[model samples]
Target chain A: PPQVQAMLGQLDTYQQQLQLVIQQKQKVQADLNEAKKALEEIETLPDDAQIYKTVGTLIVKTTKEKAVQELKEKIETLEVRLNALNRQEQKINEKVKELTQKIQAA
Target chain B: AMLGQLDTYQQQLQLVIQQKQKVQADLNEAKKALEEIETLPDDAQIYKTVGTLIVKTTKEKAVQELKEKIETLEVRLNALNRQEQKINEKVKELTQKIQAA
Candidate 1:
């Protein structure tokens, strides 16, 4: 609302900033987890091949064609989510822009 | 998404409205309790007994003061109830707007 938080935007847009920051932290955290998991998975794989993705309760664990197909699908899904959250980060920027405009007009 | 998002907002408004109504109901019950205390003959009996046995006491004065105080609180409670009702109706209108949106 344009209530207490909106009014307090002059001080710091704490709530809005926290939401964006949390998403950023989530992305960073996810990347850290993914990097660690990838290194471990690579170490565990045979010299020839290993599977690489997880999604929707399905874990791709083989170099089989079906596993590769599911792996690609899971990666696409994760990529879409990451992009959506990136846009969500811009949403907080827009909120700041809006609040600044309101403050300037006042 | 329709059911989840819209119904969740509706439930929020409903919870606030119901909570206000519950408070109003309790206020009404309190008023009724005050009325009962006022109506009890024991109060009049006590006043009569004290007047008979005591000198500085005035007859029916305590009953009159009690009646006036009870009436004031009763009116205040009624005003509060009416205000609560108006807020509830406003909440209902806001809900309809939100759902319509």
Candidate 2:
């Protein structure tokens, strides 16, 4: 019973961690969605349309070409981070499942 | 143990609540954007972000897109509400069982 209890505690810790990872993943996903939406909208704009980008506390004017480039870079970076998060989430899930089974057996 | 089950249920409830809140926030944003677009003149320049690009679009198209998004988010929010209720019921049942024990 003591071992089972210990395993339960460990499981609880892992679950909490898993929740945090998921939360981060969701936040990144939302950001990625927004960035993708922005890219799509910007691409449809006419060549002469004005664009403004927020930099720190300032909103500065930017060209359509520049904005598109920046957005593409950001999207790529976010995608990479998202993939890493997905892997971490999967690994944690596996750990949780294995620990749950062990606890059950104990 | 029932306590472990209860903990799991509580965590699930938390996740559902978080998801609901996120959806609600997005819905609010879409509605606000729609309201702003509606108030603008017919020829007004509207920029929407697709990924990272801030591109121009017509007011009519923007309104249509926002409406579609708001509809989708509403459906998701409703589903999350149902899920939350189901989880709460489970938590309640488990709590009662644990008390009986």
Candidate 3:
């Protein structure tokens, strides 16, 4: 009986973890969307075109090439993390189902 | 029933005000993007996003597109702002009436 209770507790933990991961993925996805928009616009300009990126309280001037490259890299990195998080979420969901079954059987 | 009517109008006003704010925010981004990219050399390479992929375009076209987008957003925002003012006036009038009642 206590084992079933423990399994239930673990199930709750796994669900919480999955929800947290989902929330994080959404935030990252939103950031990626914004980056993509900026990247699209940045690609339109010449290398010498001046762009400003916000750093702290100031808008610092930067070149088009550097900003475009940085945004592309950021989107790429965020995609990789998003993929990993998706995989983890799937595994956690599977574990959650297994735990629920065990708890029900017990 | 009078109070009930006011509450319904209040909810509608809230929704309209939020929509106005969203349009305003989007207009700001469009304006900023247009400002940043407007100064490129006329012959420079331009690109636009097609779904997840980026493709090459002309500087003239890109600038033109951004300009049009900014104009469109501005027009929408102007309408939204007007709607927001009307809603505020209604909300104020309703609240005042409720207080008097």
Candidate 4:
């Protein structure tokens, strides 16, 4: 029946969605780690030291204080995304698992 | 049936482009890191975070690794662009077909 086929199609879509979420979560975690590393490096630099930030292909000169602040803000943004993706992944997992069981039983 | 297939194609294209964006961001980060420390002294201490821990290394090794990452990401990005172009063409073709029908 078309109804059953539609149900299976929806299940397949959910499975793929779950897979994408897992992949995205991994990428977000990697970004978070890079942010952490940047913040750590920034903390070690001298206050008055000249720092360079990448703007496209150019490395424009900037102050150590500005670099630290930029890294801090980046870290904050990545951290939030990482945590949110984790929560989203968990929810996706539960829904996928539940749907798979029903589809299999059918 | 073809219209339904077109909808599926659009969804898949969106996902592929999303991944391309992620790879692009990764490439940018690698490029930035390499540029920042490229001219540093060889003996300069460097630490790269891998997994949950940071490992200390020389500036030279760090540069080389980031350079390799940049290269790989560039290759991946190019492939994604090609894929995006192909999908876009297909989407356009399907849209025209739908309009004619």
Candidate 5:
């Protein structure tokens, strides 16, 4: 019974970890999409089209070139974050699977 | 005797909750994307990712796709909610039995 309990405990821990990773992945994915959309829209804008960037509570004017660069950087960072989160999710899933099988065997 | 049953019920509940969270996240994303798309000019170019390609699409088409996705995810969320409730009830019942024992 203790063995079962221990396995269950481990399983719960891994599941919690998996859930956290999933949530992070979702957040990163959303942010990445938003950045991509922004980049696409900005790229299509005329050179003279007015653009602004939010700096804290202040909305400061920015050049379209600068805006595109910033968006590209943000997208890159979010992609990396997403990649890391995916790896973490996969690892935790494997642990969860192994522990669930152990629990079933017990 | 009921302890094992309780464990299984709790595990099931956790899985349901995780699924619900994922659906909710997707629903939120779809809604947000739809809202952004609605604000765009009608003639503005839109693109949606298909596999590795970001194929161009119209505003109306994108909005329709996102709306359908949101609807589907909401239905899934509702189903998961029911499953969660059912599992919670079973968990509570088994917990009471274990306490009695």
Candidate 6:
């Protein structure tokens, strides 16, 4: 609690702050999950083209070139988002750690 | 001796009031979170994954429950946020009144 702004001398106060920090931690964790989800979804698209032609029948052919490039770009954006998540999560984790130390100090 | 007693009482009263003010600050922050949670749209972009999960999964019940769980969490968060506000206001008001005397 000392590491916190200050101690209230009431254990209840500490508990309340703890709840706030825990909630914040949960929120950050949720954010990380969201970033991961976005990354995963974008990754489902092919990273690049290894051209495919119909292996069968009287059929068809087309280049997925632009779609593939877009997917790659999307993947890059997701990676950036992932990095952002990591930074955010780390910051909150630090706060939680400081808060934990504060409880101990109190 | 009378003045000393008054001063001491006044000082302690001010301290208490300030402490309450700090709590009020905490409460305001909590209130902000609660407000955000309360106002969050279910269709918010944050629900992208939830939407994806629902669309891609055959486990309808589980997916639906996940959405429900998120809503529940939002409510719980807002309630907690409100508690912070109440704590903060309680501290500030109680302290200021007691201090002015």
Q: How would you order the candidates by lDDT, starting with the best?
A: 2, 5, 4, 3, 1, 6
Docking class of 5: incorrect
Better of 2 and 6 by DockQ: 2
lDDT (tens digit, per residue) of candidate 5 on B1-101: 57878888988999888888888887887777776567666775566666677567676877787788879889998999989989998998988888898
TM-scores of all candidate predictions against the true structure: 0.32, 0.50, 0.50, 0.51, 0.52, 0.27
lDDT of 3 by residue, A1-106 (tens): 7877788778879999999999998998998899899899999898888886642211335679779887889899989989998998999989988888888888
- Per-residue accuracy of model 3 over B43-66 as CA lDDT, tens digit each: 655556546776666667776877
- In candidate 3, position B31 carries an lDDT of 74
- For each candidate, what's the DockQ? 0.01, 0.03, 0.02, 0.05, 0.03, 0.02
- Best-first order by TM-score: 5, 4, 2, 3, 1, 6
| Pairs of colliding residues, candidate 3 | none
Model 6 per-residue lDDT tens digits across residues A30-66? 6656645644554565655333221111111223563
Index of the highest-TM-score prediction: 5
Candidate 1 structure quality by residue, lDDT tens digits, B3-29:
555455556656556655755565555
For candidate 5 chain A, the 10 contiguous residues with the lowest summed lDDT are A53-62
- List pairs with backbone clashes in candidate 1: none
Worst 10 contiguous positions by lDDT, candidate 1 chain B: B43-52
lDDT of 5 by residue, A1-106 (tens): 8879888877778888888889878989988988999899999999888786543212235679878887999999889888899888888888788887778887
Off by over 4 Å in 3: B1-101
Worst 10-residue lDDT window, candidate 3 chain B = B42-51
Which lDDT values do the candidates have, in the order given? 0.53, 0.83, 0.77, 0.79, 0.79, 0.48
> What are the C-alpha RMSDs, in order, of all predicted structures?
28.4, 11.2, 11.7, 11.4, 11.8, 16.8
Instruction: Tell me the deviation in Å of residue B56 in model 6.
Output: 14
The count of backbone overlaps in candidate 1 is 0
Candidate 2 Cα outliers beyond 4 Å, as residue runs: B1-101
lDDT of 4 by residue, B77-96 (tens): 99989999999999999999
